[PDB]
From a paper:
The simplest TCSs comprise a sensory histidine kinase (HK) and a response regulator (RR) component. To address this question we have used the TCS DesK-DesR from B. subtilis as a model. We had previously shown that the HK DesK, a member of the HisKA_3 family, undergoes important conformational changes to switch between phosphatase- and phosphotransfer-competent states. We now report the crystal structures of the DesKC:DesR complex, trapped in the phosphatase and the phosphotransferase functional states.
Residue numbers in the entry:
A (entry chain C): 0 to 131
B (entry chain B): 154 to 239, 243 to 327, 332 to 367
C (entry chain A): 155 to 329, 335 to 368
The structure:
């Protein structure tokens, strides 16, 4: 019923704001928060949440590296980025991320992407497509 | 003979092409810092505004707290951008007077390179104020077709000259000429005027 | 060695000249970035202060104001994604596409096979190589009368090596773009070599990890 979410984001202010934004949803629950890629790998392999919200650039292991390590766990990974950098998109797809969105996308669209991803869909920001 | 000139241009272009790389390297460095600072902050603002809007009725006290963080993030982010440098205000006055003179159909004669970089912030600001007034006077009174502005570092002074090819219209307390002189003299500077071939103001301040 | 203290003096001298070009650049960027984002950021502060101060008195208006903050941030960030992208310059992958188009339009066979593509190169060194690659190919098109052009781009040891070969005839004297490329590569502690026997072949290298 309730979608369990783990959030990996190295910037504490943003991590806290995302948790607050997602806990506002009736059908969602933030079950854990982390600041590194390793925090995501450890929680997801142990606690097995439905969804993992993953920042890319974090210290130790990036969210893309964490996504690769969790490829065959049954967890649905959504990447969040502020900037569209080259090869980020192709590495995201190849790692099997289910969502690849902008961090500043309105919260109503992030919660919708979590539901769509839970429904087996792949949600990629057109802005992040390495073709405009 | 003038193979001198041929070679000298050859060297200046080589210096100028290396200059472009130095720029492009720093330009690279700034893009990385904007993407790190400014980008991460504009995302925080978006997210905290969104949340604050959602908490207005549910928890108005938290919505108020988020809006404090938003305002602070915004203020420091505008401050982090002014902090890319940290300074010259006479360069900003230069821009103002170019616009004003162009709008008035008066040819502006200046050289961007010769502007003194080292002067106290106070004395720089006094000169900016006097430069503005000298040019306001050109526009309002001279009927000039040309205005020249010189800025020279002469021994222990910064000297600015504002000349125009119009005609002097004067024959006072609370107005420009005396105002500039009083402010400059208080700063141990000076103001001199020549009204023979149009109007020329010479303003100097210690440096 | 006295030669070490003199090497110090050229290092200290170069840096002094360099910091002045950087200072002109910081001054250019800082003025333009303020000119385009300055009012938008100040508008976020005011509209956020105003919304906080209306939360209890007019919650409807606080909400109206937050919608405005919401979109100001969003569009300011979109302008930055643009600023930041532009500031980074011509990517080598994009230049390789430009030269394919240029050679095809000139009826010159383009021979390229990806091998040892640089895994990580600085944005500066990438931009320098893009500039050199463009010029090497402009020269092929304008002067060589080639029917074929072979480009190799490889990470070899601690360098990125680009070779641009053509099967035309070299038009220059025994000894502009050729000096431009050499100087820009050498600035980056790279190199440019040329062989003009069987057409023209340029070997350019730049350091990389
Ligand atoms: N560049 C110039 N060309 C021609 N006449 C000028 C001139 N600068 C000054 N004058 C003359 O000298 C007078 C005195 O100038 P001043 O700057 O003290 O007062 P003002 O007329 O500009 C009012 P305020 O400066 O307070 O706006 C002007 O009114 C004008 O007749
Ligand atoms: N790929 C090539 N094939 C044949 N000749 C070439 C060549 N590249 C260069 N050359 C010869 O070397 C000369 C100098 O080359 P260079 O690239 O430095 O300047 P340029 O003549 O192309 C002017 P610019 O590069 O500024 O447009 C050319 O004029 C031409 O005779
Ligand atoms: K909840
Ligand atoms: Mg991060
Ligand atoms: Mg006046
Ligand atoms: Mg050329």
């Amino acid at each position: 019923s309730m979608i369990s979410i783990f959030i990996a984001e190295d910037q504490q202010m943003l991590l806290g704001a995302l948790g607050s934004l997602l806990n506002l949803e009736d059908d969602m629950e933030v079950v854990g928060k982390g600041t590194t890629g390793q925090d995501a790998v450890d929680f997801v392999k142990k606690r097995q949440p439905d969804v993992c919200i993953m920042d890319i650039e974090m210290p130790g292991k990036t969210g893309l590296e964490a996504a690769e390590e969790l490829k065959d766990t049954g967890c649905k990974i959504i990447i969040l980025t502020t900037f569209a950098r080259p090869g980020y998109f192709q590495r995201a797809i190849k790692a099997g991320v289910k969502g690849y969105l902008l961090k500043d996308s309105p919260s109503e669209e992030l919660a919708n992407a979590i539901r769509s991803v839970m429904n087996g869909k792949r949600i990629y920001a057109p802005e992040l497509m390495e073709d405009l | 003979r003038k193979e001198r000139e041929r070679l000298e241009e050859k060297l200046e272009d080589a210096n100028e092409r290396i200059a472009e790389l130095v720029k492009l390297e720093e330009r690279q460095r700034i893009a990385r810092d904007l993407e790190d600072t400014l980008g991460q902050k504009l995302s925080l603002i978006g997210l905290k505004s969104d949340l604050a809007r959602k908490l207005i009725y549910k928890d108005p006290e938290q919505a108020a707290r988020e809006l404090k963080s938003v305002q602070q993030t915004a203020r420091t982010s505008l401050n982090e951008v002014r902090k890319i440098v940290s300074g010259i205000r006479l360069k900003d006055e230069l821009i103002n007077i170019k616009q004003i003179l162009e709008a008035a159909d008066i040819m502006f004669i200046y050289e961007e390179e010769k502007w003194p970089e080292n002067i106290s912030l106070l004395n720089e600001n006094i000169l900016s104020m006097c430069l503005k007034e000298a040019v306001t006077n050109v526009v309002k009174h001279s009927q000039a077709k040309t205005c020249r502005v010189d800025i020279q570092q002469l021994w222990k002074e910064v000297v600015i000259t504002v000349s125009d090819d119009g005609t002097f219209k004067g024959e006072s307390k609370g107005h420009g000429l005396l105002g500039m002189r009083e402010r400059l003299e208080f700063a141990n500077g000076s103001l001199h005027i020549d009204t023979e071939n149009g109007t020329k103001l010479t303003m100097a301040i210690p440096n």
